[PDB]
DNA sequence: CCGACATCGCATCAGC
DNA sequence: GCTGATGCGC
DNA sequence: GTCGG
């Protein structure tokens, strides 16, 4: 639905959401505001009163009240006062840098560091991760067009298979659901040799990251363990042509017997996972990001049910398989 | 009235 | 040195 | 902030 409808209200709730997250350090109020802004963005009617909105799930007395003030005046006093607020606006801004959460941003603004320029001058006060977020402050705020993601995908699948023909790599996320653009690339990886009660051969994941660094696809590392890599990557530029911006890429090494449970979860969407959790249980099963287990008559979950594909999970809960395209909810 | 709210691997801080 | 707590992005 | 036991 057109943003014009209640865009003024959704933006108001989102702005409030970021302040709770970055300044007040109130994550729950953050999600509360986002949930509200979200359900309000879906409502196919121009809201005329807070009471109308209050009907919607996620909108309570306070937000219905704020919505009223906004409709009557065109803005919100508490919000106007927050924007003109020196520290709060500096603190909010600083968190846009990957690596700087509410706490670091709170600390920088304290000692006088308020701008991207202040950070660029205090490089040794920033950890490895934060210097990379600074270095790509702009790039990290851009989105990734699908075609770009495909090019990016071709390279991941090609290099993984080059390291070992048994690796299985699946680019999940909104991408797998067919989305037109993305903010990042989440690649789930697995190898037959890696199972829940097996070895992690601390190189299955290393050998892959290392391979992607060799062909110069991965350009920076934010964090890397035996099962989770988080870094930056970039597509090869087409000779003397605006080189592609640096992109965020995560790689997960999951056990083969939990691999598909992993692919299901990271493909989502977030709504779709809730309908399955909800459904799965009524059918007598418990579904987490790792496994699917039967629930005895006393509520006692049993051993993890075997899974060799995504469909297997759907079959356990009396639900027909659904392509990642129809998993928007 | 008052607790839940989604999740967890990894880097790094705090403390012994 | 080590382990646990915290911060972070997801 | 919202929902709900
Ligand atoms: Na409501
Ligand atoms: Na940040």
Backbone φ, ψ for residue A134 (5° rounding)? -70, -50
Q: What are phi and psi of A143, to 5 degrees?
A: -100, 165
Quote the CA–CA distance of A142 and A123 in Å, as a whole number: 24
Q: Residues by CB within 7 Å of nucleic chain D, which ones?
A: A 28-29, 31-33, 36, 56-64
Method of elucidation: X-ray
User: What are phi and psi for residue A289, nearest 5 degrees?
Assistant: -75, -15
On strand C, nucleotides with any atom < 7 Å from a protein CB are: 6-10
Cβ(A18)–Cβ(A92) below 8 Å:
yes
Per this entry, what is the length of chain A?
329
CA A329/CA A307 separation, integer angstroms: 23
How is residue A168 written in tokens? 């299985």
Whose atoms come closest to the Cα of A36: which ligand? 1
Out of A48, A55, A62, A66, which one is annotated catalytic?
A66
CB A196 within 8 A of CB A303: no
A93 neighbors A85 (Cβ within 8 angstroms) = no
**CB under 7 Å from any atom of strand C: which residues?**
A 95, 97-105, 133, 184, 186, 230, 248, 250
Neighbours of A42 (CB within 10 A): 10
Centre of ligand 1 from the C-alpha of residue A133, in Å:
38
> Which ligand has its closest atom nearest to the C-alpha of A58?
1
Q: How far apart are CA A154 and CA A20, in angstroms?
A: 40
Check if residue A196 sits with its Cβ under 7 angstroms from strand B.
no
What are the tokens at A194? Answer: 């890696």
Rounded CA separation A43/A52 (Å): 11
> In this structure, are residues A176 and A192 in contact, taking their beta carbons and an 8 Å threshold?
no
Distance CA A255, CA A280 (A): 22
Taking the CA of A248 as reference, the closest ligand is 2
Q: How far apart are CA A45 and CA A275, in angstroms?
A: 25
Separation in Å: B4 C1' and A288 CA: 18
Backbone angles phi, psi at A322, to 5 degrees: -135, 125
A269 preceded by a cis bond (ω within 30 of 0): yes
Q: What are the beta bridge partners of residue A232? A: A220, A248
A177 annotated binding-site participant:
yes
CA of A127 to C1' of B12 (A): 9
Question: Does residue A107 carry a catalytic annotation?
Answer: no
What domains are there in chain A, each with its CATH number? 3-85 (1.10.150.110), 86-142 (1.10.150.20), 143-265 (3.30.460.10), 266-328 (3.30.210.10)
SS (H, E, C) chain A: CCCCCCHHHHHHHHHHHHHHHHHHCCHHHHHHHHHHHHHHHHCCCCCCCHHHHHCCCCCCHHHHHHHHHHHHHCCCHHHHHHHCCHHHHHHHHHCCCCCCCHHHHHHHHHCCCCCHHHHHHCHHHCCHHHHHHHHCCCHHHCCEEHHHHHHHHHHHHHHHHHHCCCCEEEECHHHHCCCCEECCEEEEEECCCCCCCCCCHHHHHHHHHHHHHHCCCEEEEEEECCCEEEEEECCCCCCCCCCCCCEEEEEEECCCCCHHHHHHHHHCCHHHHHHHHHHHHHCCEEECCCCEEEECCCCCECCCCCCCCHHHHHHHCCCCCCCHHHCCC
* Nearest CA-CA partner of A65 in A83, A74, A57, A53: A53
Dist CA A180 CA A148 (whole Å) = 10
d(CA A249, CA A321): 28
| Nearest-angstrom CA–CA distance, A47 and A282 | 36
Beta bridge partners of A249: A185, A231
Q: A205, A190 in Cβ contact below 8 A? A: no
């Amino acid at each position: 639905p057109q943003e014009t409808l209640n865009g003024g209200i959704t933006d108001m709730l989102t702005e409030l959401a970021n302040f709770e997250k970055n300044v007040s350090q109130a994550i729950h109020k953050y999600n509360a505001y986002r949930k509200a802004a979200s359900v309000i963005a879906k409502y196919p009617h121009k809201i005329k009163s807070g009471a109308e909105a209050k009907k919607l799930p996620g909108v309570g007395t306070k937000i219905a009240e704020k919505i009223d003030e906004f409709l009557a005046t065109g803005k919100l006093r508490k919000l106007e006062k927050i924007r003109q607020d020196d520290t709060s606006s500096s603190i909010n801004f600083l968190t846009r840098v990957s690596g700087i959460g509410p706490s670091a941003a709170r600390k920088f603004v304290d000692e006088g560091i308020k701008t991207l320029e202040d950070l660029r001058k205090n490089e040794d006060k920033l950890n490895h991760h934060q210097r990379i977020g600074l270095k790509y402050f702009g790039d990290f705020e851009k989105r990734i067009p699908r075609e770009e993601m495909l090019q990016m995908q071709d390279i991941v699948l090609n290099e993984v298979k080059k390291v070992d023909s048994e690796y299985i790599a699946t680019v999940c996320g909104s991408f797998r659901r067919g989305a037109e653009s993305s903010g990042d690339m989440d690649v789930l990886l697995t190898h037959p040799s890696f199972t829940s009660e097996s070895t992690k051969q601390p190189k299955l994941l290393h050998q892959v990251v290392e391979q992607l660094q060799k062909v110069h696809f991965i350009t920076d590392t934010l964090s890397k363990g035996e099962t989770k890599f988080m870094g930056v990557c970039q597509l090869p530029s087409k000779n003397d042509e605006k080189e592609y911006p640096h992109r965020r890429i995560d790689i997960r090494l999951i056990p083969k017997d939990q691999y598909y449970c992993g692919v299901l979860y990271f493909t989502g969407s977030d709504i779709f996972n809730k309908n399955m959790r909800a459904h799965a249980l009524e059918k007598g099963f418990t579904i987490n990001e790792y496994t699917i287990r039967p629930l005895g008559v006393t509520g006692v979950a049993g051993e993890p049910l075997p899974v060799d594909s995504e469909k297997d999970i759907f079959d356990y809960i009396q639900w027909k398989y659904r392509e990642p395209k129809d998993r928007s909810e």
